[PDB]
Design an enzyme around this catalytic site. Sequence first.
Site, PDB file in Angstrom:
ATOM      1  N   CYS B 152     -39.857  -8.936  34.921  1.00 11.69           N
ATOM      2  CA  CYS B 152     -40.298 -10.069  34.102  1.00 11.69           C
ATOM      3  C   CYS B 152     -39.527 -10.139  32.781  1.00 11.69           C
ATOM      4  O   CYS B 152     -39.373 -11.227  32.211  1.00 11.69           O
ATOM      5  CB  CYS B 152     -41.822 -10.004  33.854  1.00 11.69           C
ATOM      6  SG  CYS B 152     -42.517  -8.481  33.130  1.00 11.69           S
ATOM      7  N   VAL B 156     -37.797 -13.589  31.388  1.00  8.16           N
ATOM      8  CA  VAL B 156     -38.117 -14.199  30.097  1.00  8.16           C
ATOM      9  C   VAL B 156     -36.840 -14.535  29.336  1.00  8.16           C
ATOM     10  O   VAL B 156     -36.639 -15.670  28.891  1.00  8.16           O
ATOM     11  CB  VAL B 156     -39.041 -13.271  29.287  1.00  8.16           C
ATOM     12  CG1 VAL B 156     -39.184 -13.733  27.865  1.00  8.16           C
ATOM     13  CG2 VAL B 156     -40.419 -13.195  29.942  1.00  8.16           C
TER      14      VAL B 156
HETATM   15  S1  CLF Z   1     -40.928  -1.853  32.529  1.00 10.95           S
HETATM   16 FE1  CLF Z   1     -42.105  -2.835  34.270  1.00 10.95          FE
HETATM   17  S2  CLF Z   1     -42.925  -5.038  33.693  1.00 10.95           S
HETATM   18 FE2  CLF Z   1     -42.184  -3.644  31.888  1.00 10.95          FE
HETATM   19  S3  CLF Z   1     -44.014  -2.603  30.961  1.00 10.95           S
HETATM   20 FE3  CLF Z   1     -43.024  -1.056  32.411  1.00 10.95          FE
HETATM   21  S4  CLF Z   1     -43.925  -1.407  34.505  1.00 10.95           S
HETATM   22 FE4  CLF Z   1     -44.400  -3.248  33.190  1.00 10.95          FE
HETATM   23 FE5  CLF Z   1     -45.935  -5.031  35.876  1.00 10.95          FE
HETATM   24  S5  CLF Z   1     -45.568  -7.228  35.661  1.00 10.95           S
HETATM   25 FE6  CLF Z   1     -44.224  -6.610  37.420  1.00 10.95          FE
HETATM   26  S6  CLF Z   1     -44.275  -4.284  37.362  1.00 10.95           S
HETATM   27 FE7  CLF Z   1     -41.959  -5.120  37.236  1.00 10.95          FE
HETATM   28  S7  CLF Z   1     -42.052  -7.258  36.816  1.00 10.95           S
HETATM   29 FE8  CLF Z   1     -43.383  -7.203  34.903  1.00 10.95          FE
END
Ligand code: CLF
Lengths: 522, 522, 477, 478
Positions: B152, B156
């Site tokens: 994500c 962004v």
């Molecule tokens: S480095 Fe990844 S997102 Fe970032 S704080 Fe850590 S686990 Fe979370 Fe939860 S929502 Fe999904 S897992 Fe990937 S894309 Fe985002």
Amino acid sequence: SQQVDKIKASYPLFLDQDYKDMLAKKRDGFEEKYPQDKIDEVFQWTTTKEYQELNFQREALTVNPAKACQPLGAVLCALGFEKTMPYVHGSQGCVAYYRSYFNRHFREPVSCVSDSMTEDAAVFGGQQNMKDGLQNCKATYKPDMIAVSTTCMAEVIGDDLNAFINNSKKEGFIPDEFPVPFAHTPAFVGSHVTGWDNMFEGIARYFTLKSMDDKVVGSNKKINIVPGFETYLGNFRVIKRMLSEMGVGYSLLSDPEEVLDTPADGQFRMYAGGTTQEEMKDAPNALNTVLLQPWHLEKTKKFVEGTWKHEVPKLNIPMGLDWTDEFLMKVSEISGQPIPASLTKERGRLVDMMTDSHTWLHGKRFALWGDPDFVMGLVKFLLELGCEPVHILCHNGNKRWKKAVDAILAASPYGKNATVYIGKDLWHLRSLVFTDKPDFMIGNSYGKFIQRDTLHKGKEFEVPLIRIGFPIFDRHHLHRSTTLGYEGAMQILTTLVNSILERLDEETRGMQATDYNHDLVR
Amino acid sequence: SQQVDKIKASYPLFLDQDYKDMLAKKRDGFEEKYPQDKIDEVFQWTTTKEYQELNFQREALTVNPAKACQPLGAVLCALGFEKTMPYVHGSQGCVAYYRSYFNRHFREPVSCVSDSMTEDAAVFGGQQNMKDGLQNCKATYKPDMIAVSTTCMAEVIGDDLNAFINNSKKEGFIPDEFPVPFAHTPAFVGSHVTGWDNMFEGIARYFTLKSMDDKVVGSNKKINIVPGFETYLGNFRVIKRMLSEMGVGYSLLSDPEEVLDTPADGQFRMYAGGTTQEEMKDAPNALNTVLLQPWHLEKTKKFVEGTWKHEVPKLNIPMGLDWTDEFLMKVSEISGQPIPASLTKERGRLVDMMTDSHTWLHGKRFALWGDPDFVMGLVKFLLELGCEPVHILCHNGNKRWKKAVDAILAASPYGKNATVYIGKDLWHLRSLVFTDKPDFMIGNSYGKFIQRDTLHKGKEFEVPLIRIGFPIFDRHHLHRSTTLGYEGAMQILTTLVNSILERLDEETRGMQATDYNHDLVR
Amino acid sequence: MSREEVESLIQEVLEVYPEKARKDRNKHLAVNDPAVTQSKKCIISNKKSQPGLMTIRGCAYAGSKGVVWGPIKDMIHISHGPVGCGQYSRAGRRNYYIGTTGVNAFVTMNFTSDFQEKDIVFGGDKKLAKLIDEVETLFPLNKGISVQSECPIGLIGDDIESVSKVKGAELSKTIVPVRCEGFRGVSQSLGHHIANDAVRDWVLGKRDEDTTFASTPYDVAIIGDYNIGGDAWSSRILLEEMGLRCVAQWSGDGSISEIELTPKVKLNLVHCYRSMNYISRHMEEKYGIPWMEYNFFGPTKTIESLRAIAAKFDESIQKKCEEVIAKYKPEWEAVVAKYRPRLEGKRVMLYIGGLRPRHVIGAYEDLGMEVVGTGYEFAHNDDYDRTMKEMGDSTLLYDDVTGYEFEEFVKRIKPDLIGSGIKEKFIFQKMGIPFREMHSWDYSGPYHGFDGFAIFARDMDMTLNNPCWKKLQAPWE
Amino acid sequence: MSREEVESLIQEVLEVYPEKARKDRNKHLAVNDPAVTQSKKCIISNKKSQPGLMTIRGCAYAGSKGVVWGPIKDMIHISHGPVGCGQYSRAGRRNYYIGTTGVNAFVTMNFTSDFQEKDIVFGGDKKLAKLIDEVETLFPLNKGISVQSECPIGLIGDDIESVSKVKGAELSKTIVPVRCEGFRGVSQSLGHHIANDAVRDWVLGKRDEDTTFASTPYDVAIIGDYNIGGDAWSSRILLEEMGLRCVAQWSGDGSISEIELTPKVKLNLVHCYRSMNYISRHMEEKYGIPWMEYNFFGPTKTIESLRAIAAKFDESIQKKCEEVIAKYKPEWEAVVAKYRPRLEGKRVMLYIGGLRPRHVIGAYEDLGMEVVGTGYEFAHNDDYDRTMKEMGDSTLLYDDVTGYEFEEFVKRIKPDLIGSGIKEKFIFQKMGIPFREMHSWDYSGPYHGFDGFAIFARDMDMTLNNPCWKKLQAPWEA
Ligand code: CLF
Ligand code: ICS
Ligand code: CLF
Ligand SMILES: [Fe+3]
């Protein structure tokens, strides 16, 4: 009383207050029941080592046996032949019981006839019953073969099956060429597995004894497979799948997996599949004969060796990893076919599952029972899993068998706390699981009453039953499972580890008491 | 303390008196815990209808979701291709979680890489991460293909995957002919099944968009199968088996069955099996494409129809009796192959099991959750079994999907008391099983905590969980099961009826209280 | 089908038999005729089965151990012979009881002498005596022992009567020898009579000479209710709500104590006429106790029975009878209003043992269903007399039906439902015909009484109207 | 096994890498030398992971929500951002607690704002305020809320600190904003530090002016024990048998009131130095509380720690210290007597996070085993300083090891047992090498203390000597 939109069956209907009060009045009024303190005292006594000692002194009394009588096995063996009607010479009550017993385990029709011998025949013999019975059976149910065994009354009175069948053909009640193999199957000798041996040897004799002159070992390039008394459909199917995967030509002799699994498509099929008469006629031309359950195929073995001249290999039941390995290597040697990649991969997937699940299996303690070949294969697999088969019971086992299992236990550190019992029943076993409590039982549905007894002492003391064996009456469709080969080892492993994890979840489900260990990931 | 010959793990070690007294001293001295009577009071409140109404007024807070995020599905899709490395462009914490999530379900290695974007890349983009990442990945782990998705953070800040990959090739980090399909997979859109769709369409376009001119529909006489997000090995295997049994030529597009079940034979295999690049390249030459889970394959369908020019059949997921029938009949029409005797028999055996088990399943009430296609197939089958799917929850379902499920429920008397919920979570479902108690839950391991909550109210209020879905973490090897086709219907039916019978045995196990109904034969 | 088709059906199916079997079986198949109430003039029964025709009948040991003696909960019943009989019948019949199994109750256990060939050669009387002692050491709270003879016992010349007398005297124990060998008689039926005479000879005359029990004018016994799924409890509740005192239950949930007090009652209420009319007749002859038949299947028969029973007593019971009827009226009327529309018009064929083939007809009619065929395994002519009054005109009657006959009759008549046994169930389910077990109640019940009618109706509906029946045909056939 | 063999094993393995990755990874691989005790002349750590090499590391959210804050049992922790992070970390870590879940404790529940594209566009601050109100209505017995930021929060300019101050004041509730976005730092490590700073800033000082807590001379806090499988309970038992009063546990089975009472103790007992040295230093500089590192892995380290801890108190504690040591002496000696013969001589390779790759060595050596290789995902150079003291001469050390590196090292060294995480377990099982999970204890434990040693021994034995390891090669290959 009933509420129309929430109708109650016996449970929990009779827990309603008015039924509870009524039952209490019946007890106090007319049953002359022992005080509850006396019941509790005697129950507690029945769980003690002192009671166990009296229990194991029994000589004459048998309580809750773990075996059946010969004709049940003969019926099952006869059902594995194409368009064959099993036929039990003697009293009709036996046949009603054999059919219902198998009805409830397979949840399928079970065809078998009697010739309804009564007290009259016990005077003048059952020859007329055989003559009319064979004629009536053949005309009404149109089998291509009738495989005759006996009830215990016919054995006591001494009916000569061979002569009776010969006279039935001589007098014209059935065509001379119509196949009518027979075996004497006395209920007071051995058990149901012995009936299977006797019936099979009788059918082998019928189709080959007189015709050996033209026979040449190996001339048909197949291996004969004799399954023995087998009540898991997947055990017939896995052997055939493996042998096909290897390109091995084979004849499965006694193959009931079709007639015990006919589809519900709007018609009843009395007969389906099965070993052909011709496969039995041609069986002496096989390379060799393999006995999947040798410890109750003794008579068959002596006939296949003495008459067909086959050199029956010394193989254990193909259960677990080592003994499936050994089955496949011997089959590979006899047939000249290599073990294919698909079976080798399947083997490694079983090992993978063993590595994945070993930490929950290790050290787990089991009481278990069943027929000799089944029990020893389960004992073998449990040792491969790092489990301890503490109480090993085979009601219809023998000295030589017990020695072989004790040898297998001694070759592993996971057998150091195990004992093998022969001639003992499930009331003996109930004592053992109180005095030397295991973690689980592996057995048939009669085990549910031991689990009930153990829970009554306390939840701490409850020994959960894991249903593997015969008969299974209180669960549905477990007869479709597999216990042989890597497939069966996979299924047993999965059942055992998840039984363990199901019970752990139960013991840790207590909010704020034990659910600190109610892990999401296990 | 510990006794050496009977070592205790956390359960039941911490039930020892000295630990119990220590924990009570910790609570009283320093935890400032609410009094137990207050905990009891609030707990009872959370089982109420008035609480349920507050619960269902939530708009901003989600509690115990029943869904994951897009890249998880993109990873599972990528793993279905030969020697393919899943590669998630973004931050590495995501990839640790995806691998561990699948590690726990499959009990297998799960290979996936990140290009470790950090604060630096969060302002100037991750172009350099992609260049070094692709070159490092190809050299170290030697894939034939790298399939790229995004976390994500990368979504962004707007990293242009297409440009980044194109520049990696232009500047020599990876060979220009090396395949690097890609898809944007934003976690704040849809769910994990959406990531599978996105990843698959990306791969499909990479290999087919620019080469359509020589393609002729039906020239290779095969049928494409796109399975979607699938976590039962049996479901890949059953589809291939039935199509092989029909003699139907087919290409399974995304097939992770081999990489998720490699043997334990002394060597680690990072890649195994999978759809080949040739199969994707040739896939537009198929007669048609069948989508096994059409409700999360909407982008794929648009590409298959808009570019390959295939007329994707309107087929529900092949679950239960009717929808497997419809699957087979449509494949028969597309391929011209008749449905063989073997599958017709298998169908009739399922119907047989249905007739054998119908008295225990009838009217049983179920709450259930999962992904949209899986849930609606489970609903369908439960209706065919005479069961009542009372609470139907799909967190990642949409309005159009709920409309179709409501139409399935309306066509059956057994849907009269059923409600379909979309966007709701397992804390919503918890309320439902307290206020409108069903007999069982069908769902994933997160349901264990709802069963725990219901038991805390009272054994008579406990709703047992039947584990079917994803993820299953607290049992071993259920990922080997099957849910599709007649085979999976057989497995589901067996699990349901025996879960019912296990529970009845528990409720009738109490001696001289309820064991009048502790029947040997059910 | 009306008369001339059924008669043609019978001749057509018997074409396949050899001449001897055909002439015999012709006499066990008949079409009901309202103008002939005497069964001796239209059907023969209680004869030997024809060999090889796959009868559904059991044996005399089933009739004695399985039906009459086994349910008696605080005695230990010995299957005396080889291991089979006791094992196949272990807990297969749902004769429910309240007890602590293995301590003071023993119904679902299998006690056996497990004959080996050495016991055939030397006899088993010594083994049986040692067995009795072993039972006494390990099960001290047992209130008596019964010895259920399997086929070999009489054939080899054993004398269990002498062993029962010697060991009984030595141990001050009731030990009941029963010569219910399976080669005796032609069916379970003779087992019933043998078991009745054993009760009479060895149990029932023990309190003739004891009078201290406190009798009331409303004391009754339930004779011939084996409490299948709780059936007798759902009957007892109504009798006692009507003001009666059910002193004993023969033999479902029955204690030996209850049986021994039965000579003290004022009325014997016989449900299963076939299996216990014998001891009922004996108790009227020797003790002067009247007996009467009743029927607790469905509201119509249950109401009729309560009124008939109440008429044997005074106005106070007859008043309470009407109170019970008024109390349960809204309940069984709701069952009818829910389920009769779902079942009306559907045609049922039955085949059961010695009572229910006629006893359950009224309950089926209470849900608008029609019994178009019925038959018994082991009924006598007096049973068939009772059956023809309850069965409709031109309905098919069969005695000791063969598997082939039952299959062929069903194929032609095409009932909507079949009710029969475990040996029949899976045959007809594969032909797409809804089937309810009418011995075991398909592990449901009770079916007796008002509470049982609700379960009965629920059960007939769930099976007849189940979705599984419309799916047997593959859409591509 | 000789230094020169290890060094060329390192060079041969790195031959596969591209130029840039080769030079970086060479810096993170070393052979232990007693002549070098500084680590800052020997190995580099706490740097960014090279892209595309399959690091085992997690993110700063893992280190903050997964590690430090998540275990606090009577607060509600919001996973703020899209749905993934909160779901993958739901109940994966076995930080055990006593509570009524969903009523007064909430550790295994997953609270989340479930970001949708609208929240990316407009921001999640308004949604977060609504969510806090919904938490207050549905979970009235919560004693505080924490906001664990996932990647997008910082990236879109959300201001969770203002939300926390506004709603906290409105509801008179402790609401902790934690900026542990996963793109921050290089690993879980920075998540520890951010999490520690959030405790200090928003929780730890709440009772600075209060004086109703009744202190004693023996008050301690367990700092950095997250109670994996009950680990901290099996440690606390011993400290209180020794006469101490454990006022708080950070943060396994920890309550917010315990955190708040910690500045009142006499001594902070730091088990996990990596994750909580930050707050331990703060409490020393501000409240004057001394801290000390200890080790309850195995009887040797446990005995040494008990004595070192007791030596900070008076004669009476030291005497009870010897009473505890004497009580458990027969117990752990029975464990060694049964299991050391079954394990002695076996060689172990470890790869874990920030503490255990060194802290468990003494326990293996108490069972005759030798750790011939160890490494961390995210340790710093002060961890590696401590590791050289514990590890043997010429053993292999790896920082942020790659999947390929770990596999290649194992193939050459051929250890009898590997101790690492879930992403590693199934690779080496297939190779026929017994594996034990040294994060989750493979769903067993506790391993801390004297009672945990018995489980630890039992667990290594059951896996290393299991019959399954003889069965991986079919008899017809071969
Ligand atoms: S480095 Fe990844 S997102 Fe970032 S704080 Fe850590 S686990 Fe979370 Fe939860 S929502 Fe999904 S897992 Fe990937 S894309 Fe985002
Ligand atoms: S906190 Fe750390 S990775 Fe010190 S982030 Fe990690 S429950 Fe490890 S080596 Mo999982 S610095 Fe704890 C740890 Fe060690 S989660 Fe556990 S095992 S002792
Ligand atoms: S009519 Fe006779 S009393 Fe009746 S049920 Fe048959 S034997 Fe028994 Fe068969 S089943 Fe076996 S052969 Fe004897 S022992 Fe038990
Ligand atoms: Fe695995």
